[PDB]
Amino acid sequence: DLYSRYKKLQQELEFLEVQEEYIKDEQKNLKK
């Protein structure tokens, strides 16, 4: 079913976004 695939991909995108933000924050805090 094409629909389920579409939705899976859609959500995946967001999860990637949040992971990128978190690792950016970590990279900034370890210097201190």
Partner: protein
């Protein structure tokens, strides 16, 4: 970033409840955090991982939990042993 350890452990460990409807996800995020320097976070990671996928035989969880069993700081060994046994 927070400045007191028990806040850090409870903050990490809570993630074991938000995701438990999609067990595939937790190892994708905690697997990095389990290499933190200060052990409180590592303990929290072990419990988050054990509690996300409690009932299953999920393989990658055990794959990550195995090398913790020799962590020098005794209480994270206690955490990893419990988690290993819940899953």
């Amino acid at each position: 970033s927070d400045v007191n350890d028990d806040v850090r452990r409870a903050a990490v460990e809570s993630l074991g409840f938000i995701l438990f409807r999609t067990p595939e996800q937790c190892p994708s995020v905690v697997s990095l955090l389990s290499e933190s320097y200060n052990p409180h976070v590592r303990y929290g990671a072990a419990m988050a991982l054990g509690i996300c996928c409690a009932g299953t035989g999920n393989k990658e969880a055990i794959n990550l939990l195995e090398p913790m069993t020799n962590d020098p700081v005794n209480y994270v060994r206690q955490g990893a042993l419990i988690a290993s046994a819940l899953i």
